[PDB]
Ligand binder design. Structure first.
Ligand SMILES: [Mg+2]
Ligand SMILES: [Mg+2]
Ligand SMILES: [Mg+2]
Ligand SMILES: [Mg+2]
Ligand SMILES: [Mg+2]
Ligand SMILES: [Mg+2]
Ligand SMILES: [Mg+2]
Ligand SMILES: [Mg+2]
Ligand SMILES: [Mg+2]
Ligand SMILES: [Mg+2]
Ligand SMILES: [Mg+2]
Ligand SMILES: [Mg+2]
Ligand SMILES: [Mg+2]
Ligand SMILES: [Mg+2]
Ligand SMILES: [Mg+2]
Ligand SMILES: [Mg+2]
Ligand SMILES: [Mg+2]
Ligand SMILES: [Mg+2]
Ligand SMILES: [Mg+2]
Ligand SMILES: [Mg+2]
Ligand SMILES: [Mg+2]
Ligand SMILES: [Mg+2]
Ligand SMILES: [Mg+2]
Ligand SMILES: [Mg+2]
Ligand SMILES: [Mg+2]
Ligand SMILES: [Mg+2]
Ligand SMILES: [Mg+2]
Ligand SMILES: [Mg+2]
Ligand SMILES: [Mg+2]
Ligand SMILES: [Mg+2]
Ligand SMILES: [Mg+2]
Ligand SMILES: [Mg+2]
Ligand SMILES: [Mg+2]
Ligand SMILES: [Mg+2]
Ligand SMILES: [Mg+2]
Ligand SMILES: [Mg+2]
Ligand SMILES: [Mg+2]
Ligand SMILES: [Mg+2]
Ligand SMILES: [Mg+2]
Ligand SMILES: [Mg+2]
Ligand SMILES: [Mg+2]
Ligand SMILES: [Mg+2]
Ligand SMILES: [Mg+2]
Ligand SMILES: [Mg+2]
Ligand SMILES: [Mg+2]
Ligand SMILES: [Mg+2]
Ligand SMILES: [Mg+2]
Ligand SMILES: [Mg+2]
Ligand SMILES: [Mg+2]
Ligand SMILES: [Mg+2]
Ligand SMILES: [Mg+2]
Ligand SMILES: [Zn+2]
Lengths: 68, 91, 251, 71, 108, 50
RNA sequence: GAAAGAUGGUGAACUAUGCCUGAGCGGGGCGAAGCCAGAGGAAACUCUGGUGGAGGCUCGAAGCGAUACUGACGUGCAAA
RNA sequence: GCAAAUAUUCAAAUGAGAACUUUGAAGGCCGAAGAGGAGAAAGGUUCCAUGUGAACGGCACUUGCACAUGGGUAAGCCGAUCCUAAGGGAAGGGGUAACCCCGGCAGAUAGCGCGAUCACGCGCAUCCCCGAAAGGGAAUCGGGUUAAGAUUUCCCGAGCCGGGAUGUGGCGGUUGACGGCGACGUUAGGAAGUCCGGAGACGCCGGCGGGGGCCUCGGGAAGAGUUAUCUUUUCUGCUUAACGGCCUGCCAACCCUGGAAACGGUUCAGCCGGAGGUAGGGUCCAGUGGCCGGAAGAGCACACGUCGCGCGGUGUCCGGUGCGCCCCCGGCGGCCCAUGAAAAUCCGGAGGACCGAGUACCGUUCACGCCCGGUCGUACUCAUAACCGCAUCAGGUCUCCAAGGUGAACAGCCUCUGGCCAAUGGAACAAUGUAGGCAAGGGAAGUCGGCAAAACGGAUCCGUAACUUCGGGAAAAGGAUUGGCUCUGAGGACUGACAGUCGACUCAGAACUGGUACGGACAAGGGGAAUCCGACUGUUUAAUUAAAACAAAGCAUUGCGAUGGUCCUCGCGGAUGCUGACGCAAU
């Protein structure tokens, strides 16, 4: 229900406590990075495949990355 | 088109209530609907709001008045009397 | 017989006053020092139609004399009052339509309304729609005054009884024919259960002294005595005369 | 194609089938929006706009063809 | 055409039992229960609306539910009285305060 | 009804446990007279009246 | 074997009336004030066409009621 | 005697036994103000499974709402709980022989409250409790799931409210933010006693505008049906919740510049303007509005191919409409001798007592973070079989949803979704019946009486008398037309006096045609001349009287100025009275 727009803020809101997980759904034309905190689900719609890859890399070690 | 030879506002009562009852309520059906001059803003915008209560639409002032006419002749006599009676004893 | 409607009305069962939407008691202010010995300035805020009463009520928002708060008082509107008017209360209130003065301060001939009767009982005469009392005369050797009530009677009242100068609004209301049992019904819902009113002559003897008979007639003098027991005192009570009022008797 | 109407397939009164008030309401918005279009296109100045507006209200004109001819 | 049913045990169509038909992700029509229309605040002086505040059912104005900005107007007497009313109060206060000392002048 | 007080539900519980035919074995207890359960109630015949 | 008389209590879940708080009453017909235009007039105001949509107005659906057959039934479907 | 509510039939299966059970094919009915889907009340386990000797299911049974044994009702978000209304009970007091009766009578009033304790100061108003599962109201949505539970109680996902502390970050210190001329704006931005305002919070009616849903039209894609013949065809579906952000900004309201007559602006109607219109430009408000997140991974639909809640694939598009129906909202207009509820809870404001730093301390209605969320209801029927009427009784019993055709229409008549064929069956066509038709010639001669039935009935056009309260009579009366097919004409929108595209509907007229039939079923006034009564509308003996009876508006009479009139109480006291002669009361 909350979407973030800038990768730096998404990274910051996923490199925090309460980050239970990050779902990643690849669909036609885009990827969606959904991080589950306590209150709000934060979502990011990303377009560049290599940049999406860099984010995939940049998730903090430990945060369970589901791939669907 | 002229639509009523003589009835006027009392044509809504149709063929009931009697000639004189209709003819003697006509003069007050008219008055309780008529637009009366508002002395505080000079418009003709005072229309009855409730029995004895005449309010103006623009200036928001609502003024206690007669039952079917804003100014009753009795209260006109009263107002003139009260002003006279005040002024003869102020001096 | 059985108990008769004139007797059933004292029970309170269904004959109580239909007062769910009435705006409260319409009366003067609690007489105090300031309004014994000076004037208090209050401002009308609204002229509100009081259900079940033909006279409009005026919400008047005084300033409390000795505590820090407003006083929403509630008067019987005198024909002339408008929102935003300043009404002044007290003995040195100027004789203006809407102000309330003691009768020691209304010159003779003046019209007043809502006349108190014991100084501080907050208005009892000349209150219904379009009625007023004229201050006929004064007597300063006893501190009393005389008024001509609406009824044509003449009452000596204390000279310190307050009164609202002017006449009550809503006048001329009872001139309009109602023309409909519907209008009559909607009139009496908001006053009290006293309509429709059945002729006694069309009742059975067990519930009305006029009742019964192969024809409809009273059968005995319809004028009853003042002392007749409750349930017998129906008809024309203690009548001095009857028949159409002609001549001096119609005064 | 206009079939199936007529005086036997008709069982409502004119007002019920199409209210005279709706005819009036449509034809007034028609003539009136024409008049505003003219007053904005400067084919009419405000004075004969007002005069034709009150005449449109007052029912001289029955259709925009005659409103245009008389303008 | 897939008739509807209530979702609560309130079987009477009172004011509090407003219903809105919606079509759900299932292709199925349900009711949603809506709030009743609220008036929102009014100026005592004029009776007009009060600008800058939405029209919410009174409980959902609670401090812990709205942002503060959405509930108030930054003026003196703002959020109770309207702009014209405050303007007329300032003018009347000034004119009458000055008149008081102009009336103390005449006492000589 | 669907909105019943807890008192009435409490008493419906007991008027439920009071419906069973008498046990099969009581009938052989010594010097016995209880034959059938003469305090049956049916939902359509005898309304509790409460 | 009464019609009754009395002492003390129980009932407005039906019905009677008052009140508080909710719910409900398609489609049509007549065409009242008000407003507009045209024409007429020394004036007063009048004639013609609109609009408007009043009313304890009217034909009528759901409702509510019960006129007529003095129809059916009348140990009835039913103590209406 | 088992007879109203149209209707049943054929194979099969189970079974000792089939008209009554189950399956399938058919044929019909309810026809959406339903014989459909849910509830309030009331019932109480009737709900679901397994089985069954009797009894019951007014015939029958393998069957059941019957009998036996088991199963089933999950809530911080739906309710109750909370608040008050009509109104009820009550402490002190007054009455009463006592039970009981009075609540405004005013009494150190039932409760004291608020900052404060490391204590004390301040206020005490009109002052208790109960009372609504239809009034007010802290907060929830979607998709799954069970034999029976849930739509939102369970499960997956996504939220929200209240309360409890607290931690990090940020914001302010010109002590208590900034921007805008202004309306107002930004998710942070001191405040004690005290006071004020708003929301809560409001009648009916007319009509217009908008939003959501449904319906209707056309294209595209999927599947189904029809096909001796014609049909780019017909039928089904093509979905997107709360919640968060952004955008838009209706109809009203509001701000700034400006100064209007040659008067203008605008409505279906109004109405608005030197108290400042038209105009230009802005603000705010609604939203069940657009986009994105929620979210395609869900749901549906097809298409396959795997043995065993597999798995894989494709689509889940694009416009236009309207006096269209439901719900809601906005704003006008009207009606009132009627003006159409209260309070909880919440928000806002006035004033400013008292407060603090800058190697640091006082706040912060901001962001994120942690914890907790109790008691009771919850299955089922809601009716021509689960409620009441001694019944599985044609009776009665409050509501929400509401498709297609014809038509003015929620009339009737037919259909689809959904539900049924449950009302004991077989044979026959006699009287007499009950419900429904038709009749030659005549048309009330029958009869107490035109009782019953027939005739008229929609709509368009014309015409419409006596009488009249001049409003009516009036649909008076009396006439004419109505189908089907092919056309002609008129009535508009959007884009750039013309051109382009589009347009669902209404209204006129003509031809041709038929066994003169055309409101072809349905639905649907007979009319006139007079008398008597009641003015009218309304109400009335539930179960034999619907009326000329009662009420009524109108008219009149009487009592009463509070230390009063009419009335109630055993008493104390009370009703009219939250009243006051334009009032109360009695005729
Ligand atoms: Mg009565
Ligand atoms: Mg009378
Ligand atoms: Mg009478
Ligand atoms: Mg009698
Ligand atoms: Mg007697
Ligand atoms: Mg008699
Ligand atoms: Mg005699
Ligand atoms: Mg034609
Ligand atoms: Mg018209
Ligand atoms: Mg509603
Ligand atoms: Mg704001
Ligand atoms: Mg029963
Ligand atoms: Mg005796
Ligand atoms: Mg009752
Ligand atoms: Mg009852
Ligand atoms: Mg409805
Ligand atoms: Mg009628
Ligand atoms: Mg009807
Ligand atoms: Mg009979
Ligand atoms: Mg018989
Ligand atoms: Mg036999
Ligand atoms: Mg029979
Ligand atoms: Mg309906
Ligand atoms: Mg049902
Ligand atoms: Mg049997
Ligand atoms: Mg069952
Ligand atoms: Mg309570
Ligand atoms: Mg409640
Ligand atoms: Mg409620
Ligand atoms: Mg308020
Ligand atoms: Mg309310
Ligand atoms: Mg402007
Ligand atoms: Mg929305
Ligand atoms: Mg209004
Ligand atoms: Mg449940
Ligand atoms: Mg249930
Ligand atoms: Mg019984
Ligand atoms: Mg049609
Ligand atoms: Mg229909
Ligand atoms: Mg014959
Ligand atoms: Mg005859
Ligand atoms: Mg004979
Ligand atoms: Mg004869
Ligand atoms: Mg004879
Ligand atoms: Mg007859
Ligand atoms: Mg006639
Ligand atoms: Mg009559
Ligand atoms: Mg009528
Ligand atoms: Mg009877
Ligand atoms: Mg009868
Ligand atoms: Mg008394
Ligand atoms: Zn004015």
């Amino acid at each position: 229900p909350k979407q973030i727009h800038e990768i730096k803020d998404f990274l910051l809101t996923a490199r925090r406590k309460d980050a239970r997980s990050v779902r990643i759904k690849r669909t036609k034309d885009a990827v969606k990075f959904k991080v589950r905190c306590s209150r709000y689900l934060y979502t990011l719609c990303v377009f560049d495949a290599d940049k999406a890859n860099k984010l995939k890399q940049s998730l903090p070690p430990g945060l369970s990355v589901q791939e669907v | 088109t002229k639509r009523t030879k003589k009835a006027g506002i009392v044509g809504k009562y149709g063929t009931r209530y009697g000639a004189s009852l209709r003819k003697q309520i006509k003069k007050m059906e008219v008055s309780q609907h008529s637009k009366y001059f508002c002395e505080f803003c000079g418009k003709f915008a005072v229309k009855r709001k409730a029995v004895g209560i005449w309010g103006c639409k623009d200036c928001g002032k609502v003024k206690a008045g007669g039952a079917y006419t804003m100014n009753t002749a009795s209260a006109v006599t009263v107002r003139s009397t009260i002003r006279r009676l005040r002024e003869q004893t102020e001096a | 017989g059985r108990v008769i409607r004139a007797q059933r009305k004292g029970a309170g069962s269904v004959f109580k006053s239909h007062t769910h939407h009435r705006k409260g008691p319409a009366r003067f202010r609690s007489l105090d020092f300031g309004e014994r010995n000076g004037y208090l300035k209050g401002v009308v805020t609204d002229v509100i139609h009081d259900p079940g009463r033909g006279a409009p009520l005026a919400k008047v928002t005084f300033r409390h004399p000795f505590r820090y708060k407003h006083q929403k008082e509630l008067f019987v509107a005198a024909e002339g009052m408008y929102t935003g008017q300043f009404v002044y209360c007290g003995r040195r209130a100027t004789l203006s339509v809407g102000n309330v003065l003691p009768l020691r301060s209304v010159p003779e001939g003046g019209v007043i309304c809502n006349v108190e009767h014991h100084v501080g009982d907050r208005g009892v005469f000349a209150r219904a729609s379009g009625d007023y009392a004229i201050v006929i005369s004064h007597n300063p050797d006893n501190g009393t005054s005389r008024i001509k009530l609406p009824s044509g009677a003449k009452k000596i009242v204390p000279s310190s009884c307050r009164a609202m100068i002017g006449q009550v609004a809503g006048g001329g209301r009872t001139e309009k024919p109602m023309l409909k049992a519907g209008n009559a019904y909607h009139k009496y819902r908001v006053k009290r259960n006293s309509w429709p009113k059945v002729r006694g002559v069309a009742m059975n003897p067990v519930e009305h002294p006029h009742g019964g008979g192969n024809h409809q007639h009273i059968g005995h003098a319809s004028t009853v005595r003042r002392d007749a027991p409750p349930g017998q005192k129906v008809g024309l009570i203690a009548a001095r005369r009857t028949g159409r009022l002609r001549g001096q008797a119609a005064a | 194609k206009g079939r199936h109407s007529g005086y036997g397939k008709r069982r409502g009164t004119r007002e019920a089938r199409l209210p005279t008030k709706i005819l009036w309401m449509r034809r007034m918005r028609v003539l009136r929006r024409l008049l505003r279009k003219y007053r904005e296109a400067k084919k009419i100045d405000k004075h004969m706009y007002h005069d034709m507006y009150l005449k449109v209200k007052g029912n001289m004109f029955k259709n925009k063809r005659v409103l245009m001819e008389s303008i | 055409v897939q008739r509807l049913t209530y979702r609560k045990r309130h079987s009477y169509a009172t004011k509090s039992n407003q219903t809105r038909v919606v079509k759900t992700p299932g292709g199925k029509l349900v009711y949603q229960y809506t709030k009743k229309r609220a008036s929102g605040p009014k100026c005592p002086v004029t009776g007009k609306k009060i600008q800058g505040i939405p029209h919410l059912r009174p409980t959902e104005y609670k401090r812990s539910r709205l942002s503060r900005n959405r509930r108030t107007v930054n003026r003196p007497y703002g959020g109770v009285l309207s702009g014209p009313a405050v303007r007329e109060r300032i003018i009347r206060a000034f004119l009458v305060e000055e008149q008081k000392i102009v009336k103390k002048v005449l006492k000589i | 009804p669907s909105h019943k007080t807890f008192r009435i539900k409490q008493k419906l519980a007991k008027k439920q446990r009071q419906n069973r035919p008498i046990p099969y074995w009581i009938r052989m207890r010594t010097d016995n007279t209880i034959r059938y359960n003469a305090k049956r109630r049916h939902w359509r015949r005898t309304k509790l009246g409460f």
